[PDB]
């Protein structure tokens, strides 16, 4: 879908962390506050049927 | 055990009181969300799991606090410890060059630390008992037994601080002074860690020489502490740290 | 084949965009050595020495051993049939024979089949080498260029570049180290020339 | 996966947006211890000399020579 | 920063604090008395004996360390003074080992001391 | 004027030093210094030389 | 190495064509495909010079305004009609820096 709305940052510094497993796009919607920043108009859907 | 680590900000520092009440108000309605205002001045959770973190950042966004606020990534808590004894000594003495302590590290058993952990070594029994519980079960000595004086960390800390040599052990009079000085400094040690500030776990202390000053006044009785506890991570850093 | 690759590399921008392109088309496995060799006559008959076409050869060889091998056969093989082209050709060549070299996807061993005595010696080779050198020299400073054509453990292929054994072609090949103007090697080995008697 | 490649929206971009993933990719220590080797010499001596006898005499023998004949 | 003057805004060799809490280096703020009673953390002038010297422990390294926590004292870490001892022992140090007990005494030395005479010299977080 | 001006330090702490000239923005950036790892890849990138050590 | 003109010259290649489409009376995009705009001269095409065909790599938003990362993915350039294959005025130019050693070397000689 189109997208809905459109510097530095300390916890981005990239000498303090520890890339083990590679963040991607099924976690940060899997988790949406946990994974990301400003999560607006959001709904967090789950499902251990 | 609570093991996940994730550090919060406000996006405008202004706002930070804000998020105070919010993290405030989170602690109160969550068991054992564990929220601390870290020495770098950041704000850590230590929490259990993805699903646990989710619903509480949804709580902390959605209605105890509505500033905007970033978040970083999830790290653990971690733990330090030991592989082979202290093959060597350094040895501290008081800021006044008034007490000189020896002592050294070495690893104990994963069991014994365990049982520490399950409360069934409780040294509220009689040193007698304590003697009973460890001779029977781990072939350690009863005058080992006689040793331990502490456990580090606090009420259940998996490492030992134990006090053997016999001759200047048996002044009890300066030693039996100093005890109470020098547990603050191991507990010390053990919690405050020696390499990244987290928690040891599963190690022995052993105290050989404790050259006391002669009446350890308040001299002894206030300087005494981090010697004590430069001590351990004399011992620990000396020889052999481990992650 | 040979259609489709040159078409590909013309139509990128850089050897990772044209390495992707071609892994992305597919081929029997057959032709790996006749790929590298392949980027290889390209290259050599380019306007002027880019390192393009090396970096791409190059990895290739890096994400598979055919190429590794099969660019063993190809330096011996350009060191075989080096004269057969002209100084532009050969100077192309030999610099990039000196990208793999001193980016190590050559292994320094390949100096076995460089023999300095002046009789074995083309001219074509001489001026090969020449430029050769004076490409790893100037390119890893010449230092760490000294320190490896000193170790010991690839002396075995280096005997034939440097000779005590023979002394008419110690002679030669130390007067050559001098022409090209790595006095470092030069004098250090009629050194022990000097020793020898 | 979009993870943080491509387009927002391929809509007034001139490509379809769509993306993909380059192939091409890849000294008192022995001492102080002796005094504890010392230590329960004298100790289980005079307790492998009251399981045999406690009179505090038979095992003040039996520690004295396990004291002085050990440290000589 | 930690143990530059302000005045100068640049380091301080031998240090006096102010008895309001920065570090005012003596060498020149005795030229700043003496050319201009005044101060330059408060315009409002300020007496001449209240300047007490510090004691900013060292390492191995050298570096101004607590002494007795040994912890290297830098822009990050509280740092409290006790006046009267002349000694200056991390805030923490002294907090925990005396705002715990009831032995109000010096952190370096056998000497007492007054429930109000610890100041915070230098703390990131205030 | 300082808005439409650009100044650039190199020292001990800004390994590298960066202008813009004709219609080129450049940034240099010396081997000695904070280049433990050093390419050669694509061509944006010239390799200057010390005309009288002839090393890059 | 200037990711902002790669996308550039894409957009304003394709803006380029889209306004031929324009002067005729459609852009449906089968009616007018590569051949038509880069067919030399001779054979009656247009003539079309392309920059626009090429992949733009892109790489992790976040490290890459950080620390130069690397190359990971690539998106893809203009559209052409099939796998297609389209040739590039990059290739054809040669770099400065290499230009810059030919002419050292060359005078040189001549002198």
Redesign the interface.
Known sequence: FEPLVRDWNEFNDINKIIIRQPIRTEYKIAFPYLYNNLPHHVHLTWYHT | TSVIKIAVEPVNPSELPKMLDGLRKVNKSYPSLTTK?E???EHVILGTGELYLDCVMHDLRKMYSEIDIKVADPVVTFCETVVETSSLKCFAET??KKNKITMIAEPLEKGLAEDIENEVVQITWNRKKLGEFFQTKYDWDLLAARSIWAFGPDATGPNILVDDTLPSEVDKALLGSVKDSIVQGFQWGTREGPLCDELIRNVKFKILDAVVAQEP???G???I??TAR?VVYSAFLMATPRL | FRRTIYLAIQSSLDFEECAHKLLKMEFPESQTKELCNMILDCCAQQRTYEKFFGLLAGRFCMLKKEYMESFEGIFKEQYDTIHRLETNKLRNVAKMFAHLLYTDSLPWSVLECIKLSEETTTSSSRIFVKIFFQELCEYMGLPKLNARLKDETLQPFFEGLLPRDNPRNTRFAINFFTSIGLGGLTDELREHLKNTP | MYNGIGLPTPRGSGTNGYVQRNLSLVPDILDHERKRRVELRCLELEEMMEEQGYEEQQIQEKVATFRLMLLE | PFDHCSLSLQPFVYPVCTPDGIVFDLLNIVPWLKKYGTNPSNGEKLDGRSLIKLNFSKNSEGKYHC????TVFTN?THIVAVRTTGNVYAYE?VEQ?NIKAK?F??????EPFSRQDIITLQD??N | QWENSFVSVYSKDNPNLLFNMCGFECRILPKCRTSYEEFTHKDGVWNLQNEVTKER | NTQELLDLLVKCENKIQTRIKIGLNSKMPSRFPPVVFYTPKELGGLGMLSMGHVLIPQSDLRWSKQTDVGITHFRSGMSHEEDQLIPNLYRYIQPWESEFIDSQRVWAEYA
Request: no cysteine; net charge neutral.
């Open positions: 205002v020495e770098s001045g800021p006044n006044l308040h001299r009785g206030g300087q502490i981090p430069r | 002494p007795v926590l040994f990050n140090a080992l032995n005494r010096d952190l370096l030395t056998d990131p977080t």
